[PDB]
Amino acid sequence: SQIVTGLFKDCSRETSGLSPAYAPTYVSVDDKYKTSDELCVNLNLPANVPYSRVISRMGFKLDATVPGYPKLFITREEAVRQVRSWIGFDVEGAHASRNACGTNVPLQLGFSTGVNFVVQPVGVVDTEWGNMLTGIAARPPPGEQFKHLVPLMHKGAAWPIVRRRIVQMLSDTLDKLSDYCTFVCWAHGFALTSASYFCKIGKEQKCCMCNRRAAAYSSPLQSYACWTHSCGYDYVYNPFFVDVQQWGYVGNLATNHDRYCSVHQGAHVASNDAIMTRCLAIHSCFIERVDWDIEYPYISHEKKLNSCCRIVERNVVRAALLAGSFDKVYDIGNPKGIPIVDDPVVDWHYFDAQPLTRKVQQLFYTEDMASRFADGLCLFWNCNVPKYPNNAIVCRFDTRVHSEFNLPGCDGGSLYVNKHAFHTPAYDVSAFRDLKPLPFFYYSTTPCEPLKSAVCITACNLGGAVCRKHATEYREYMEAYNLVSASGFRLWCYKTFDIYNLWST
Amino acid sequence: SQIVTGLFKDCSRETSGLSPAYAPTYVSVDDKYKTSDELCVNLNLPANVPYSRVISRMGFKLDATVPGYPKLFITREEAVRQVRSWIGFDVEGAHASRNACGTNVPLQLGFSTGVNFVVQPVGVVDTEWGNMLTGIAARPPPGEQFKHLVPLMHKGAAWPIVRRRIVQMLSDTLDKLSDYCTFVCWAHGFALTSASYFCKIGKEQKCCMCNRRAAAYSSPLQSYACWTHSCGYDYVYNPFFVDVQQWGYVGNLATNHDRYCSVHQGAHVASNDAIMTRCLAIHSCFIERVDWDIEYPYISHEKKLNSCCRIVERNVVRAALLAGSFDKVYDIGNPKGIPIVDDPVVDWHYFDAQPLTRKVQQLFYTEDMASRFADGLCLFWNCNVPKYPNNAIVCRFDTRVHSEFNLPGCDGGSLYVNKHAFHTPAYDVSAFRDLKPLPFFYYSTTPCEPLKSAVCITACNLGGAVCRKHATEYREYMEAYNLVSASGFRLWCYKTFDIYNLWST
Amino acid sequence: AGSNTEFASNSSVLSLVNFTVDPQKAYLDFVNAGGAPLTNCVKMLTPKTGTGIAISVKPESTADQETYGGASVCLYCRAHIEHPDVSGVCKYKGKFVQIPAQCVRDPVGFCLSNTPCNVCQYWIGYGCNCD
Amino acid sequence: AGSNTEFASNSSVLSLVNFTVDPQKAYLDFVNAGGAPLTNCVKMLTPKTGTGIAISVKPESTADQETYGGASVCLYCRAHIEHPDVSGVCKYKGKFVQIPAQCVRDPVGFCLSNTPCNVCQYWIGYGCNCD
RNA sequence: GAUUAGGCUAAUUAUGUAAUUAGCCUAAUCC
RNA sequence: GAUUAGGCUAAUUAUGUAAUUAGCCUAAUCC
Ligand SMILES: [Mg+2]
Ligand SMILES: [Mg+2]
Ligand SMILES: [Zn+2]
Ligand SMILES: [Zn+2]
Ligand SMILES: [Zn+2]
Ligand SMILES: [Zn+2]
Ligand SMILES: [Zn+2]
Ligand SMILES: [Zn+2]
Ligand SMILES: [Zn+2]
Ligand SMILES: [Zn+2]
Ligand SMILES: [Zn+2]
Ligand SMILES: [Zn+2]
């Protein structure tokens, strides 16, 4: 074509171009060798045989489409699908100086895991015999905003040592989460230029030791491995890239992040930028837009956890409705209008935020709403309200427990992935100052046909006895309650609830 | 033992030692793990797992004696025998900086051939998973003496390129001279440190293609070759090392070299260091001491050259004595008291410098004997005097001609190796200003039993005729004289000499 | 600061070659899929009276060849990546490369897919008569 | 600047290992001819109640074995040279090595001339009973 | 130090105008 | 930045003294 690009720019301070036998492109030839027909002439001249010219790596574009090669700069809809592999990524760079001018080189690499890598300033040098990836002269960017980068110029490690560390960190983070690695970036240009130092691409490959997808490449072994088998590997293979700035944002990263989140604050380091970038991506994909058509595959004990949650819900709601003999039930957040317990004869009312059934209302509970349902009990199973009423039974997920189905979110919230992605607000204990912790207990009324527990409400336990029909059932409820509580769920009830009432029923 | 050494010094800037499972020596273990029994304990303490430490290579000592392995730090008496393998060697270094401090790395390598190589700064880095030889950050030494090393810090090449270039240069230099390579060094410490980058040692090996001794090693092929078959090889195998500073010298290299030589001066580069070192070794072994008991093998047309020189001597001295009819001959430098020509009846006197016969004298000709021997002719076959008289027949080797039997010497002189090594002072044409160059001719008087030449003094050529008995002899004389002239020998004679006189004899 | 070297129309494939594990196969698959071959190669004016060998110090092109600069037709020099040779020295840089006139559409691809004969230094199949 | 690591008495053989083509053979030749074995290894204080396997992440030494730091008994770690592994990763560094009590004179040579069994992780001939 | 957009100047090419290249200024983002 | 030699100080070990290690200063050589 005719439009030139800044990619592979000659950054040397030489005043002359190269001879035709040494110049890589026609433009790079000194004009004394050129003729009118876009042809060069081998003049009788001496040549600067030994030379060293720094070449710019800024300006990459991975937009080419070749069959068999995956599309790495994925779109927003695929990023939402691959959310489990999201890693924030930020690079702070250094300016080439002394014998070169006009290119930037990575200095500090930060990831949303909270890890920073400091590297020596290394660039590409063209010589008379080939290319070199070697250390070059560099200086920190001028300005007070980059004053903390001055000490880092004396703490840089070599790139072949840092590549293995990056691969090891990523394998530790994502081994039980995903087979992929999606780098979430802001202003992806310098990020991609830095990614050229430690990433390799190609056709999709299988792990040499199992059936998982390969995520790391070994250049000494020339082999491919998944996260589990990637020990000693020195390249990330086929990562995805996402640019948050292309999702319709103006201004810089900091002002966009500070508008929605007040938790991710601290010193100016690349890791904080990466954390902020991932937080902004989470807010943009799961709070600004809530699309629940995306279904996520199971990776752990999730199906079992759902059934355990339903069992604990049935038992707790039965005990709460029975105790106190409240005949009015209000269920907030039910999208189907189906009661959990039916043995006590009580009136039922259903409410939801986005219902799809005319039987269920569209009420948005905020704070005033306490005196309107004062006559019954209010159900808040998996419903998030910053102020729960006095007469409520509430089940709230603790966002501080980390697991395979719980991911960091925005403003202290968490992304909970159970066949869907729900964003749950931060766990504030001041929202339960009007309620009490629910004690551990069991209640049943099944006919009967050793175990000893003081909280085991059972017709045999009224007289201090026990039977196998309830002995095994208490153990089953025990494992279900333990699974639910260790998964990150917490139960709250009205302050007048007590266990010893259940002896009368 | 108890004496610590600086070899493998930890040049990192870390303030604590390593854990017992990661430290290579007991000394390198941090003191918190040590007990009083010279034993370590594995504490319940966290380990700083990702680390990198620069390891110093300064302080090698190749003094180990293993059967089957040659001695590489040879002494002076065998260096004199391997004189044909002598290559000067000097390294100019750079200091580790930034993340390391306490070691030097090679920057410029120079040899007595006159070639300089510039390298990237490469050092050993100790990682938690092992070793790796990679580029590190280095700065030129401070001070004005090293200001020329500042531009070279970003002008080097990768070590695998430089290794093959060094092997190629050495193969070019020593292919027709020797099977060996001797590195002549001054202050051999950093030189041996740098030699660790491009030399391999082991048992003595045979070339994979011929019967010559192997001088190069190929690591991609794991093979051994001599200088003739070492194309593409990347390591020098079993080189010798000599430290001239250990031969009893005080001060630095420059003031010791300048005391004896005046022609090796120039800019401050490694090649000039190496040339000065080789010149100083040559002066120490062949001028300061003259041990002519050492025998050197023949490598070319030397036994033929001696006979040709003797034939040329007989013809030239016969013609010189016949022309002018001088009856007195003084032969300087003859240690055997044997004349070469006896057909004219002339008086003979003999002299020598270090003789072993009572019939001869120990005169040291300097300048004043010009009137002492004016009554006859003075013979200077292979004698070195800076002032030749008016009545002399002189043979002097041209030191500017370089051959397999002519090596560079000291103060512009040369080393001529024909069975024994003679140091010949520099060929100065201003010492023959009292003489004339001998024109080519042939003279003989044998009885006779087509060729045409005006300088062929022969009884047939007086009448313009020629015979086979002289035609074949004249072609033999052409051969002998052409060899002698091409080898580097120049003839000078008294100014009144002329060929046309020999017509009367 | 600096002087520009490459066209934007060559920016994509070179970027791909800068990231792939095997650059040669990447470029060949890109071109064989309908991608545009590289441009900006250094072409030399030649009186067409050369000997016709593949790689030479001076331009030696016959009537059926064209001379290019050595670095211009090397993929590793164009993309500024590491060369595959164990010595590390490019066999094309500093010399001139003769390409058959029917393969001037993709000189870089021709140099990737062909090698010269060892004894006669001609292209194998395009001048090598070592039957 | 820097901190010293090794003794002078070990400086000779390690220097040899830094220059030879075959470091393991050179070390075994040096110690076989009468050279002193490497010293300054990291010996561990152990309760002498362990499983007795060759290489472990915790000291597991029985009554007939002594435990050493892994990097201290590896010749390639001691001489700071390239490991024979293609990936360059040491099998000893960061772990603890059990040497039989009758072989503690030369731990480095013992680790050079012996290997652990691939199924039971004991030294072959010093604990492995895979008949 | 890098890119994007806008303005000005100069050069080349093409047919008063357009494209590209080079330089300067402003704004945004990145460093 | 490296080593060697000398001096001073401190610590450890051994039996007033000796050795080793660590730091500072002087000189020489190397960079
Ligand atoms: Mg940032
Ligand atoms: Mg020098
Ligand atoms: Zn796997
Ligand atoms: Zn945030
Ligand atoms: Zn019962
Ligand atoms: Zn040979
Ligand atoms: Zn000299
Ligand atoms: Zn005759
Ligand atoms: Zn190339
Ligand atoms: Zn051929
Ligand atoms: Zn090791
Ligand atoms: Zn076994």
Instruction: Name which of A10, A126, B114 is nearest C94 in CA terms.
Output: A126
Q: How far is B161 from chain C (nearest CA, A)?
A: 6
Structure tokens at D56: 């472990």
**Which residues of chain B make contact with D86, given a CB cutoff of 8 A?**
none
For ligand 6, a single-atom ion, which residues have Cβ within 5 Å? B 207, 209-210, 212, 226, 228-229
Give the CA-trace dihedral at A219, A220, A221, A224, to 10 degrees. -20
Closest CB from B127, B137, B155 relative to A120: B137
**Which residues of chain D make contact with B56, given a CB cutoff of 8 A?**
2
Task: Provide the sign of the torsion angle of the four alpha carbons B33, B39, B44, B46, taken in this order.
Answer: positive
Q: Are C41 and C68 in contact (CB under 8 A)?
A: yes
CB atoms within 10 A of CB A153: 17
The domain defined by A303-504 carries CATH number 3.40.50: yes
Please give the single-letter amino acid code of residue B125: V
- Chain A residues 156 to 215 whose Cβ lies within 7 Å of strand E are 186-187, 189-190
Pairwise CA distance, residues D25 & B68, whole Å: 12
User: How far, CA to CA in Å, does B416 sit from each of A445, B84, B354, B396, C4?
Assistant: 118, 11, 19, 12, 58
Resolution in A: 2.5
Q: How far is B483 from chain A (nearest CA, A)?
A: 39
Instruction: Name which of C45, C55, C51 is nearest C123 in CA terms.
Output: C55
User: B8 CA distance to ligand 11 centroid (A)?
Assistant: 15
- Chain C residues 1 to 60 whose Cβ lies within 7 Å of strand E are 1-4
Write the DSSP string, D51-112.
---SEESS----TTEEEEEGGGG-HHHHHT---SSTT-B-SSTTSEEEEEGGGTT-HHHHHH
Q: Do D12 and B5 touch (CB under 8 A)?
A: no
Phi and psi, residue D118, nearest 5°: -80, -10
Q: Do A220 and D89 touch (CB under 8 A)?
A: no
Pairwise CA distance, residues B21 & D71, whole Å: 6
Question: Where do the DSSP E strands lie in B402-462?
Answer: 406-408, 414-418, 420-424, 436-437, 442-443, 456-457
Pairwise CA distance, residues D27 & D37, whole Å: 9
User: How far, CA to CA in Å, does C33 sit from each of B101, C38, C103, C109, D66?
Assistant: 53, 14, 18, 13, 64
Pairwise CA distance, residues B493 & B440, whole Å: 12
B443: left (phi over 0), alpha (psi -120 to 50) or beta: beta
Give nearest nucleotide to A270 (CA–C1'). E31
Report how far Cα A339 is from the mean position of its chain's Cα atoms: 35
**Residues near C49 by beta carbon (within 8 Å), at least 6 away in sequence:** C62
User: How far, CA to CA in Å, does B339 sit from each of A337, A424, B334, B379, B441?
Assistant: 136, 117, 9, 11, 22
Domain ranges of chain B: 76-121+134-286, 303-504
Maximal C-alpha separation, chain C:
55
Helices (H) and strands (E) in chain D, counts: 4, 3
Query: Which residue does chain C place closest to B158, by CA atoms?
Result: C88
Give nearest nucleotide to A3 (CA–C1'). E20
Q: Is D90 annotated as ligand-binding? A: yes
**Packing angle, helices B468-487 and B303-322, rounded to 10:** 110
**Residues near A11 by beta carbon (within 8 Å), at least 6 away in sequence:** A53, A54, A55, A56, A96, A100, A101, A102, A103, C1, C2
Instruction: Name which of B252, B203, B248, B395 is nearest B311 in CA terms.
Output: B395
A251: left (phi over 0), alpha (psi -120 to 50) or beta: left
Chain E positions under 7 Å from a protein CB?
A: 1-4, 19-22, 28-31
What would the 3-class secondary structure string for B207-252 be?
CCCCCCECCEEECCCCEEECCCCCCCCCEEECCEEEEHHHHCCCCC
Alpha helices in A242-302 (DSSP H): 253-260, 270-286
Write out the CATH class of domain B76-121+134-286.
alpha beta
User: Which ligand is located closest to the Cα atom of residue A256?
Assistant: 4
Q: How far is the CA of B34 from the C1' of F11 (A)?
A: 17
Burial class (CB in 10 A: 0-12, 13-18, 19+), A382: middle
Instruction: Name which of B92, B123, B95, B96 is nearest B108 in CA terms.
Output: B92
Q: Are B108 and B269 in contact (CB under 8 A)?
A: yes
Structure tokens at A481: 């309650």
Helices (H) and strands (E) in chain C, counts: 4, 4
Q: How far is the CA of A48 from the C1' of E11 (A)?
A: 29
Pairwise CA distance, residues A35 & A56, whole Å: 28
Q: Within 7 Å: CB of A31 and strand E?
A: no
- Please tell me which residue lies nearest to nucleotide F13, judged from CA to C1': B36
Structure tokens at C58: 């001076």
Q: Is C103 annotated as ligand-binding? A: no
Method: cryo-EM
Burial class (CB in 10 A: 0-12, 13-18, 19+), A7: buried
A317: left (phi over 0), alpha (psi -120 to 50) or beta: alpha
Q: How far is the CA of A250 from the C1' of E27 (A)?
A: 14
Burial class (CB in 10 A: 0-12, 13-18, 19+), A403: middle
Pairwise CA distance, residues B435 & B440, whole Å: 16
Maximal C-alpha separation, chain A:
114
Local structure of D10: helix, strand or coil = helix
How is residue A148 annotated by DSSP? G
Report how far Cα B273 is from the mean position of its chain's Cα atoms: 14
Q: How far is the CA of B32 from the C1' of F18 (A)?
A: 29
What is chain D's length?
A: 131
Burial class (CB in 10 A: 0-12, 13-18, 19+), A284: buried
**Which residues of chain D make contact with A231, given a CB cutoff of 8 A?**
89
Local structure of B139: helix, strand or coil = strand
What is chain C's length?
A: 131
Chain F positions under 7 Å from a protein CB?
A: 1-4, 19-22, 28-31
Instruction: Name which of D107, D120, D66, D112 is nearest D91 in CA terms.
Output: D112
Local structure of B504: helix, strand or coil = helix
Domain ranges of chain D: 10-130
C to D contact (≥3 Cβ pairs closer than 8 Å): no
Closest CB from C86, C88, C89 relative to B220: C86
3-state helix, strand, coil in chain A (%, to 5): 25, 25, 50
**Packing angle, helices A270-286 and A253-260, rounded to 10:** 50
User: B231 CA distance to ligand 6 centroid (A)?
Assistant: 10
Give nearest nucleotide to A2 (CA–C1'). E20
Q: How far is the CA of B19 from the C1' of F10 (A)?
A: 27
CB atoms within 10 A of CB A319: 23
Q: Within 7 Å: CB of B27 and strand F?
A: no
Local structure of B185: helix, strand or coil = strand
Instruction: Name which of B130, B127, B56 is nearest D82 in CA terms.
Output: B130
Chain C (100-129) residues lying within 8 Å, Cβ to Cβ, of chain A? none
Query: Which residue does chain C place closest to A218, by CA atoms?
Result: C21
3-state helix, strand, coil in chain D (%, to 5): 30, 15, 55
Q: Are B24 and D107 in contact (CB under 8 A)?
A: no
Query: Which residue does chain A place closest to B119, by CA atoms?
Result: A134
Give nearest nucleotide to A56 (CA–C1'). E2
Closest CB from B160, B220, B232 relative to C88: B160
Q: How many CB pairs (< 8 A) connect A and B?
A: 51
Confirm or reject contact between D89 and chain A (CB < 8 A). Answer: yes
Structure tokens at B220: 């991609």
The domain defined by A76-286 carries CATH number 3.30.420: yes
